[PDB]
Design a protein around this ligand. Structure first.
Ligand SMILES: Cc1cc2nc3c(=O)[nH]c(=O)nc-3n(C[C@H](O)[C@H](O)[C@H](O)COP(=O)(O)OP(=O)(O)OC[C@H]3O[C@@H](n4cnc5c(N)ncnc54)[C@H](O)[C@@H]3O)c2cc1C
Ligand SMILES: Cc1cc2nc3c(=O)[nH]c(=O)nc-3n(C[C@H](O)[C@H](O)[C@H](O)COP(=O)(O)OP(=O)(O)OC[C@H]3O[C@@H](n4cnc5c(N)ncnc54)[C@H](O)[C@@H]3O)c2cc1C
Lengths: 536, 536
């Protein structure tokens, strides 16, 4: 029973979690390999803007923006476990584990960011204007300032992930880390003491390779969005997919099923609305709809009524789509219809951040069009019929047309006063902050709303619920060590990123709140793995 | 090193799943032991009404009533997977597994029920008037008739579970099945071929015993409602507890963590509202609130407004309590307040079916009382403050009193016309079916509503979200065999009832839809287990 290759540390996956874990490991003097399931490096990280939320970061301190630790913990506790949050409780109402993980994020994200930049692997610039998603909470004492992004990201920052994967992987090759693509890890090999001593991977040609790890196996294999069975059986909502890399199929869940782990936070994903047709069609370029485009634009349900603030934070807005009507045995908002006019088409269109409104040249198969409102509803009906088998054979109400006219009349009044009496669109900072581009109007009272045109053409797109990726898996301690059911480390076995349980439950603290913590844990995991004895 | 006892079949748990599995096994000629963690037999089953939903049962056929199998499958497919339900799809939109499991229920529930009755273990009577929970759906072609209950159950049927446990356990002892209480199974023992050959159990004195199973170990160990870590980490909603027996702590989840199983349907429980204070205080006698008592009674939120049909099916009503307000980072309906008057107190009180309205002599610590509405709100506020750390420090709104008066006036008008224009209380058959007792009023237009008295005293109780129990665990095939990750049986290992994955997802088809299927699977499991070779 022997191995065709041997390294000190074997890393699984080449997104943020894998690359950073590998670099930190290598810089301690270990030999390292990165095993990537796909043909290309980068996973979901590659598609991201690579905002990374780093509490008490060096640029903030240089700018004179304070980030006190007790207040950091209160902010995250209040957002993460609202029912239990208590400022007088010794762990703010969090479990000891959740509290310890949040503390580790605060302690380790900045040194991790600093080392990656110092070595030239992830040079950054500060994004001082990027504001926390629940900045209005009094617990938040550093409402803006925590976000970094790759130094050479574009001005929109939309290509940040591509830049990060380039800088990280360039530094990895420079520093002698080995890479194997088309290697799907499928097993952890144990010694007789039950310690991880290597992996088995399936190659594209269907050969199996065994690779030894002298000190540690570190998983950075991403989530399970694109295993439909796992997704449907674990998540708290029945999402249609998400912007995760399609190779993120929850392999670690199968890999650990015989290792005695504790699967934790399996009920939660990072959530976001998606352009429904791109989810169903498996458009690999799809982004979550982080900014819902248009000011002269509303969402309506199948009755032709507004049901939600369209500018609400994406992780929260997605949840509205899965409200349950128990009397009718249906999801009334399963798909919502975004409706906009020529003004929003011309001035709110974007290639970035999952906008449904796209400029000339962009893929617009998901866009529904008509010269009149009555014509639009007939076009929407055809689209619903096309996807009937995915959406409970949903149909527009027989009163749709008249309801939509009433909805627009009401909205147009709100747009003129600047006050949305129904859903408070534009009243929270995050509504304005992620509003997207608009035609700036001299006398606009609220930047998130402008009256919808009294003439066509009119445009629409179906909006459904998806993920960025999942955030449940084997529980680790704060050093990235995968625990057995008695809360003790399985020696040699580590996990970082979306493949292990996040301490953020169902919450999404700020932009960059996936990547920032992840880099902290890669640093802590690599530092602990470096201290393993060489084994078997 | 060895075993202190040996049987052909070892059954774990003494609720419906375990007792029926054991009886079926014994009647095939195997020696059988039943191992119970608690001091007494019966688990959650003991507390139930023991309705059991049996498609195509003998009473229905005697009435000349068809229960056509394709239509049975369409009903359960429509309720279980609403998004994907399609009458033209080869498995109605279900996965092959879901479809096969639902078919097995139809095929095996009636023969299982007939044999239990034939042997004198579970004599039954028909419950002809119990209509399915979604009987109005056109897919349901046998809208009433499927429910059986223990022949000697009381007229209310509330003691059906006690009767069933008595008849089942009496037959088990009569037929030579062995029983051991205070035996907490904690491990499955495997041979070198990886087959289950017995168990290890922890006894009360903290000794461990090994018991050999020549043919099979059959788990019927119930769900994980009362492991708060598992509950919070897996279920789709953050429930506070449930009427499951307190010994249902998800031991099988830990037992199988190194066995390579597929945990499935972990995101779903059988849901129901509960008397919140009884959940928090772990009242072991608590029932889920299947019947929300009172016609002169409303539920209000912390703003003093109605938000839901109070008579809606319990599994669906519970979901209303967990709607999420992303703008305020809170659950607006986390607890609702049931408010009633003297008429409902006197004529709707019940010790059964989880009623918050309780008769004289009953434990009434959960009941809030005051001589004016303004006084009632002051008493409710004190109760919210008592449980603040569990409910996000919820407070009544500053306009609560005025809103409550407006809510009562509006409801009173609905009660007089018989038409609840807001939430349609009483319009579905199931609202009437679980309406509970009421004072007969000559000219009452809708049995579920009567105007609330303009004089006190007034009464209230906090209502929160809970379970009957969970319905996620190791996936089995239709023969109750626990599968490995490659969908192949782990030889000798079986599971029946709440301890394994239900094929009903998040749905609750009808009264008796937990016990009816469970008896079908106990029969199929026992039949397959009987065919195992004797091993090790
Ligand atoms: C469009 C978009 C924008 C986003 N923007 C941001 C943002 O700006 N900030 C932020 O914090 N978050 C953002 N997110 C979320 C963020 O991208 C992810 O949470 C993060 O990139 C996940 O990193 P990871 O290393 O865990 O996984 P990934 O980057 O998904 O990498 C996992 C890798 O493991 C590989 N793998 C899987 N199985 C195996 C196996 N068996 N063997 C070997 N390799 C395997 C996969 O192929 C993949 O390459 C965004 C998400 C999307 C979709
Ligand atoms: C008040 C109430 C009323 C209900 N009414 C109905 C109804 O009318 N019809 C219906 O269909 N459903 C009803 N339900 C739901 C139904 O009672 C359950 O779904 C069903 O009884 C579960 O049966 P079971 O055998 O899987 O588990 P249980 O009856 O819970 O039995 C499991 C047993 O396993 C034991 N156990 C646990 N761990 C171990 C271990 N490690 N070793 C050994 N033993 C162990 C437990 O102590 C317990 O005795 C009701 C539920 C409640 C709470």
């Amino acid at each position: 029973a022997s191995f065709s290759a041997e390294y000190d540390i074997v890393v699984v996956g080449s997104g943020c979690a894998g690359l950073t874990s590998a670099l930190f490991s290598r810089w301690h003097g270990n030999s390292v390999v990165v095993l990537e399931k796909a043909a290309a490096l980068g996973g979901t990280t590659f598609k991201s803007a690579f905002w990374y939320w780093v509490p008490n970061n060096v640029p903030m301190r240089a700018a004179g923006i304070a980030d006190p630790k007790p207040d950091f913990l209160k902010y995250v506790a209040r957002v993460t476990r609202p029912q239990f949050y208590d400022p007088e409780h010794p762990t703010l109402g969090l479990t000891q584990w959740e509290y310890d993980m949040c503390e580790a994020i605060y302690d380790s994200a900045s040194p991790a960011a600093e080392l990656l930049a110092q070595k030239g692997a992830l040079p950054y610039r500060h994004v001082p204007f990027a504001t926390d998603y629940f900045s209005e909470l009094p617990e938040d004492k550093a409402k803006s300032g925590r976000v970094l992004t790759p130094k050479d990201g574009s001005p929109s920052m939309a290509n940040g992930g591509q830049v990060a994967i380039r800088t990280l992987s360039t530094a990895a090759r420079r520093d002698g880390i080995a890479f194997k693509t088309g290697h799907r890890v499928q097993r952890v090999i144990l010694n007789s003491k039950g310690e991880a001593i290597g992996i088995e991977a399936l190659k594209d040609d269907n050969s199996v390779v065994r690779i030894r790890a002298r000190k540690a196996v570190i998983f950075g294999s991403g989530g399970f969005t694109h295993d439909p069975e796992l997704r449907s059986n674990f998540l708290n909502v029945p999402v249609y997919g998400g912007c995760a890399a399609f190779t993120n199929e929850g392999d670690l869940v199968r890999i650990t099923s015989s290792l005695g782990v504790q699967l934790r936070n399996m009920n939660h994903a990072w959530l976001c609305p998606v352009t429904f047709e791109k989810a169903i069609g498996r458009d690999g370029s799809m982004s979550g709809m982080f900014s819902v485009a248009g000011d002269s634009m509303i969402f309506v349900d199948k009755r032709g009524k507004r049901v939600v603030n369209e500018k609400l934070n994406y992780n929260e807005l997605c949840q509205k789509l899965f409200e349950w009507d128990g009397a009718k045995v249906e999801y009334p908002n399963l798909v919502l219809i975004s409706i906009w006019d020529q003004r929003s088409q011309d001035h709110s269109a974007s290639n970035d951040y999952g906008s449904a409104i796209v400029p000339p040249g962009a893929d617009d198969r998901h866009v529904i069009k008509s010269d009149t409102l009555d014509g639009l509803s007939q076009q929407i009906s055809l689209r619903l019929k096309k996807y009937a088998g995915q959406i409970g054979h949903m149909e527009l109400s027989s009163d749709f047309n008249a309801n939509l006219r009433e909805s627009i009349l009401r909205f147009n009044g709100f747009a003129s006063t600047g006050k949305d009496e129904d859903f408070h669109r534009g009243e929270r900072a995050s509504d304005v902050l992620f509003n997207g581009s608009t035609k700036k109007e001299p006398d606009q009272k609220n930047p998130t709303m402008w009256p919808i045109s009294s003439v066509g053409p009119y445009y629409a797109a179906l909006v459904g619920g998806g993920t960025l990726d999942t955030k449940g898996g084997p529980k680790t301690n704060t050093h990235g060590q995968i625990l057995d059911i008695h809360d003790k480390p399985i020696r040699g076995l580590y996990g970082v990123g979306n493949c292990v349980a996040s301490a953020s439950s169902g919450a999404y603290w700020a932009g960059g709140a996936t990547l920032g913590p992840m880099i902290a844990f890669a640093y802590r995991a690599a530092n602990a793995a470096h201290g393993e004895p060489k084994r078997t």
